[PDB]
Scaffold this active site. Sequence first.
Site, PDB file in Angstrom:
ATOM      1  N   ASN A  69     -13.813  35.213 -40.547  1.00 22.72           N
ATOM      2  CA  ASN A  69     -12.927  35.638 -41.625  1.00 22.72           C
ATOM      3  C   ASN A  69     -11.500  35.158 -41.376  1.00 22.72           C
ATOM      4  O   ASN A  69     -10.579  35.965 -41.235  1.00 22.72           O
ATOM      5  CB  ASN A  69     -12.949  37.161 -41.761  1.00 22.72           C
ATOM      6  N   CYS A  70     -11.324  33.843 -41.323  1.00 18.07           N
ATOM      7  CA  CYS A  70     -10.010  33.256 -41.090  1.00 18.07           C
ATOM      8  C   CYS A  70      -9.950  31.827 -41.620  1.00 18.07           C
ATOM      9  O   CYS A  70     -10.915  31.070 -41.504  1.00 18.07           O
ATOM     10  CB  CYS A  70      -9.677  33.274 -39.598  1.00 18.07           C
ATOM     11  N   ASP A  71      -8.813  31.465 -42.204  1.00 14.36           N
ATOM     12  CA  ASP A  71      -8.628  30.126 -42.753  1.00 14.36           C
ATOM     13  C   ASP A  71      -8.385  29.111 -41.640  1.00 14.36           C
ATOM     14  O   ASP A  71      -8.947  28.015 -41.650  1.00 14.36           O
ATOM     15  CB  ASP A  71      -7.458  30.113 -43.737  1.00 14.36           C
TER      16      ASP A  71
END
Length: 120
Positions: free
Chosen positions: A14-16
Site C-alpha cells: 500500500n505505497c506508491d
Amino acid sequence: GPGSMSVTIYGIKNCDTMKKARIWLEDHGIDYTFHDYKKEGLDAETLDRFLKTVPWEQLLNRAGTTFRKLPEDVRSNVDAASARELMLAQPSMVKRPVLERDGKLMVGFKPAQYEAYFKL
C-alpha cells in the site's frame, strides 16, 4: 552477462514509492524480490537485526504522520526502546523501499536522484 545472484527488496504493498521502485529497477533490467513487512514475518529477531543494521533514527520516516503522532516532548525524547517497539508494533511505518544484500540494508532513493547519480 548472466546473473546467478539476485536483489531482494522489502517494504509494503500500500505505497506508491514501492511501485516506483519495483518499476524503475525492473525497467533498468534488474530483478528485485518484492517482500512485504508482513510477508517476511516481522518478529523480535527481525526487528533487532534491522535496528542493529541501521539507526532507529533512520529506520522510520519522520516527515510523516507516524512521527507527528507523538507529542512535542516525545517526538524529541525518542529512545531506542520506544522506536523498536514502534517498529515491531507497526512496521508499516518503517522506511521504504528497503534493499537487502549480504545482510547490509539500504534505504530507497528518489527517481530523479537515482538517475542523476547513475547518469554519466
